[PDB]
Amino acid sequence: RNSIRYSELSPLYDTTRLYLVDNKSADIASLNYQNDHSNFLTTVVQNNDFTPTE
Amino acid sequence: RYSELSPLYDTTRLYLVDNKSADIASLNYQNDHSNFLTTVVQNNDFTPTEASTQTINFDERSRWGGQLKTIMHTNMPNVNEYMFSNKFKARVMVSRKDILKYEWFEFILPEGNFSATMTIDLMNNAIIDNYLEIGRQNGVLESDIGVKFDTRNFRLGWDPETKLIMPGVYTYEAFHPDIV
Amino acid sequence: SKSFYNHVFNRFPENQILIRPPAPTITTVSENVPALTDHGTLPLRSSIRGVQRVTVTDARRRTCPYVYKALGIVAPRVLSSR
Amino acid sequence: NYLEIGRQNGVLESDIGVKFDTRNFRLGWDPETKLIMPGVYTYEAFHPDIVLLPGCGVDFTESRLSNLLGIRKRHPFQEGFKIMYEDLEGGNIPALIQPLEKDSKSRSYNVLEDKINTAYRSWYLSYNYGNPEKGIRSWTLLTTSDVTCGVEQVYWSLPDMMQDPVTFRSTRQVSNYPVVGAELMPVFSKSFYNHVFNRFPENQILIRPPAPTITTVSENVPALTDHGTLPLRSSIRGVQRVTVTDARRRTCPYVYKALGIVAPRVLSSR
């Protein structure tokens, strides 16, 4: 009986989606300099408060 | 679960700040620092208008209290109209002949931050400006003014036999403000 | 108040009654000093809206135009059950 | 500015048009002759003031020097702060049984028709003697001079040690770290009791202003603050980041010493 909650946040259950996309703007510059579309790296974190390295 | 998120327990902080950039433009156009609106939501994904409908919820199975600390700063001058330190009333002589006539007036000082001696000079100056606008042109002399603010102890050099101030001048030392 | 140790304002130099008063050897002037205050703990509402009103008034319940900085900080905690 | 432009294009040293003063003009004014009888304005300091000629003005939209002058707006959240000659109605400085029309070195005092008032206007005269409901007094306010120019708050951040307070987002951008405490930037005013800066000694309008009997200077005082108890992360890394930012969330280059001391303790179970 001691929790503190903010109305814009809520936890997740039972199912969701993960996206694997080959043309994110930040991933192009810092991850895939020597790669091509047949073998590449991508970030599944969709939060722009962080760089792909972070 | 996502590793950058975690829930909160037992205590936190809420900030009430008067100079947020977005709140200035859209909330407080007709307000001042004595009575204003502010947002306690510190998340810039939303405008203050959008934030107004959001809430922060403390668990309803407990009763909560809040410890409050404040910081305040002012710039008030000591002689001003809002605090009634600007004016006073007095009764002076308006006409000589001998028949003498008197009347009440209200006197006004200009605003500023002054020492006590400088304030007393301004009160004397207000009396005299009344004697130059009325008075003087109606036959009163500069020996019947009738209201003065002083600081001296008259009768200091008094003599018990002759009952006069022997030096011929009153002692020119300040003791306490006085009305003559 | 602060203490220190030390002609339109003299129109009747000759007159012993109307001479300009002597100045005190102690002079006082008024100062504004920032105030930091702890007000203790007060009961809090269970649901807090995102926009809040802050007000400062005098003894006659007028707002004061000479305030130019005011901040508040609140620290919630549990007082009792239910 | 008048020596680099201006002077070489025909302007005289009697049409400058902007001056900052401290005097109360019209002190020795006479209600019958309507002139300053002593022949010189009273040389005493009352409050900082702005004196203007027609066509001139000052603008404090991007400046904090209006706080040092003690002139503020009654609606401080409305953007823009400009004071022009047309806004100072009723504040004309009385001239000089005839007014003096020129100075010792033959400089015009800009006396007008009716031979009582001068073209110069001042904020202080308009505030105190002008129309209460139409002059400058209706939307400006007179305050004590603040030598620090107005101090604001500072914020502390410890992103690797404390949990984020409610509604703050986790991030690695410096201008958006969650805030763990607040206080005033520790600069304060102190009071005391008491020629390139005088280029027109003869001119009664352009003379160097008298100095106040009260002088104020700003000081830096070390600040020792207790911020209370905040929730702590269960695992603490060996290297920690410490940040101090201002109200606009910029770092402050004038901090040269900052220390923190933390005392952990148990708050609740599980």
Residue numbers in the entry:
A (entry chain WA): 48 to 101
B (entry chain D): 52 to 148, 171 to 253
C (entry chain D): 456 to 461, 478 to 553
D (entry chain Y): 203 to 298, 364 to 461, 478 to 553
Lines quoted from the article behind this entry:
Adenovirus-derived nanoparticles (ADDomer) comprise 60 copies of adenovirus penton base protein (PBP). In the ADDomer, the PBP monomers spontaneously assembles to form a pentamer, and twelve pentamers organize into a dodecamer characterized by high stability and thermotolerance exceeding 50°C.16–18 The PBP monomer folds into two distinctive domains; the jelly-roll fold domain which is located in the core of the dodecamer and assumed to be responsible for multimerization, and a solvent-facing exterior domain, called the crown domain. The crown domain comprises two highly flexible regions, called variable loop (VL) and arginine-glycine-aspartic acid (RGD) motif-containing loop. To expand the scope of ADDomers for new applications, we engineered ADDobodies, representing PBP crown domain, genetically separated from PBP multimerization domain.
To test our concept that a selected ADDobody can be reconnected with a jelly-roll fold multimerization domain to yield ultra-high affinity ADDomer-based super-binders, we set out to graft ADDobody-AH0, derived from human adenovirus Ad3, onto the jelly-roll fold of the chimpanzee adenovirus serotype Y25 PBP to create a chimeric ADDomer, called Chimera, displaying 60 copies of AH0. This Chimera AH0 nanoparticle was produced using baculovirus/insect cell expression and purified by SEC and ion-exchange chromatography to homogeneity. After two-dimensional and three-dimensional (3D) classification and 3D refinement with applying icosahedral symmetry, we obtained a 2.2 Å resolution structure from 377,978 particles, resulting in the highest resolution for any ADDomer-derived nanoparticle structure to date. The overlay of the ADDomer Ad3 jelly-roll fold and the chimpanzee jelly-roll fold domain in our cryo-EM structure reveal a virtually identical fold, with an RMSD of 0.49 Å and differences only found in the N-terminal region of the jelly-roll. In the structure of the Chimera nanoparticle, the N-terminal regions comprising residues G47 to L59 of adjacent PBPs are observed to undergo strand swapping, stabilizing the interaction between pentons. In contrast, in our previous cryo-EM structure of the Ad3 ADDomer, we observed a hairpin conformation of the N-terminal residues, and the interaction between the N-termini was stabilized by hydrogen bonds between S61 and the main chain of E59. In our structure, the penton-penton interface of Chimera AH0, the N-terminus of the PBP forms an anti-parallel β-sheet with a PBP from an adjacent penton, involving residues 50–54 and residues 106−110. In addition, polar contacts are formed between R48 and S113, N49 and D61, and R52 and D110. Y53 can interact with N94 and Q105, further stabilizing the penton-penton interface. Chimera AH0 was passed at concentrations ranging from 0.325 to 1 nM over immobilized ADAH11, revealing strikingly low dissociation kinetics and an estimated avidity in the picomolar range (~200 pM).
